[PDB]
Amino acid sequence: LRIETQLLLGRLLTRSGDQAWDFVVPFALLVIFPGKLQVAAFYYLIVKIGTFLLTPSSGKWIDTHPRIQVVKWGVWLQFFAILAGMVFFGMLDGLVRAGGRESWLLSVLFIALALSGVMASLGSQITDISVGNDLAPSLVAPEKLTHFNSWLRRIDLATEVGAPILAGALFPLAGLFLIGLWNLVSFVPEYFLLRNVIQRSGLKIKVLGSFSDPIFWLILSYALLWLSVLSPHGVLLAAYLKDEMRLPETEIGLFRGLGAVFGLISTVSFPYLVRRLGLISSSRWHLGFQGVTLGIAVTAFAMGSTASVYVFLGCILLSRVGLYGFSNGEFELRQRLIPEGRRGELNSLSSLTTTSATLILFSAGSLLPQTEDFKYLVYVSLAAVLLANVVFIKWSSR
Numbered sequence: 001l002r003i004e005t006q007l008l009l010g011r012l013l014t015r016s017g018d019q020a021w022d023f024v025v026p027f028a029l030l031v032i033f034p035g036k037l038q039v040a041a042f043y044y045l046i047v048k049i050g051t052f053l054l055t056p057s058s059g060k061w062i063d064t065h066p067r068i069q070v071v072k073w074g075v076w077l078q079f080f081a082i083l084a085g086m087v088f089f090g091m092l093d094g095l096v097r098a099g100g101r102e103s104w105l106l107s108v109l110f111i112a113l114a115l116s117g118v119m120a121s122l123g124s125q126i127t128d129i130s131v132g133n134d135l136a137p138s139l140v141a142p143e144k145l146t147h148f149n150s151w152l153r154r155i156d157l158a159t160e161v162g163a164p165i166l167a168g169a170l171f172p173l174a175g176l177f178l179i180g181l182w183n184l185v186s187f188v189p190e191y192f193l194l195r196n197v198i199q200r201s202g203l204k205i206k207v208l209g210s211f212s213d214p215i216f217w218l219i220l221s222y223a224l225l226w227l228s229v230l231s232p233h234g235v236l237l238a239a240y241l242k243d244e245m246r247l248p249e250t251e252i253g254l255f256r257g258l259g260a261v262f263g264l265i266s267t268v269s270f271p272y273l274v275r276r277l278g279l280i281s282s283s284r285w286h287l288g289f290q291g292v293t294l295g296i297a298v299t300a301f302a303m304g305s306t307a308s309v310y311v312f313l314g315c316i317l318l319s320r321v322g323l324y325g326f327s328n329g330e331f332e333l334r335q336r337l338i339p340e341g342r343r344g345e346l347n348s349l350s351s352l353t354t355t356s357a358t359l360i361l362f363s364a365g366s367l368l369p370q371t372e373d374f375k376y377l378v379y380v381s382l383a384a385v386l387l388a389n390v391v392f393i394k395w396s397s398r
């Protein structure tokens, strides 16, 4: 197997486990704490805030340690965070059936589960930056990164779609433990693939404030897109389509499942324009395409009838092609421009800015819960996309 293929292989194997575990966690939490949707929501809060605080620290860490040390810590931190996740899950489940739903021990085991969620989240982040933003631009020719990145995206999408199917089949919470074992095993092949490629190549040879770097505006333009509720899997939109739009749930599900389809189209359209028009302009056209498509979607949203609801949803799906396109573009731009010595720091600034956006989106769905308040979330989402377009146009003047 070639170098570029080995990198994609380890990614594919570990992702299918990631997407599987990330799928059953809310459902498992629902089994242990039924009727309390606040539990699953509070779990993901601790993870995101936990990963947040630990992001700049890990960034400086990646830049001051051997690559084989980042990979080792990056992967095995996930391995034991999931292993502990299974244990605490089993203890939580076992204790509840035993009748201890109102004890301090239940809370301690939940914080433990949450904290293990933080570590897995962190290790996954350290690994993403290591594999995709350090090892890849060090092993793969610059003219072949666009091809590399497309297959990364398809891995994400394939496993995203493959997760509810396989894990849904496998899943007292015994199916959850078959998911975790899958997830655990899935970590191993990549670590050794990553270990061995380092040991036999020049990757061993690497010599070991952030907002004031020009590439932050590239980072900011991508993070702004995370401040959006105009997404097929967005819960606020799914709820809105159900009650205010009075759409069939069968059609809401179809709209949801077509997100990965249009995302896959980007892996065809975006590399094509890069080969024809170049990296920057391709990112511009795709990012602009998202703006125009969403701009039409919002125009139809108000007003406003139940006849424009498909123009609303249809243009959202079209914007997914543009969104996923610019995503690979901004990603490759960080692969190409970020200096080797600051790959851990600057890419962590990226994760920090996207995590912040997600946290704001959490706080927006909590402070604006009404379905009559959804109207403002549409207007703000569009604004964030339009601002992103301006910020990226300005930056691309380089």
Ligand SMILES: [Fe+2]
Pocket: 013, 014, 015, 017, 018, 183, 184, 186, 187
């Ligand atoms: Fe994995």
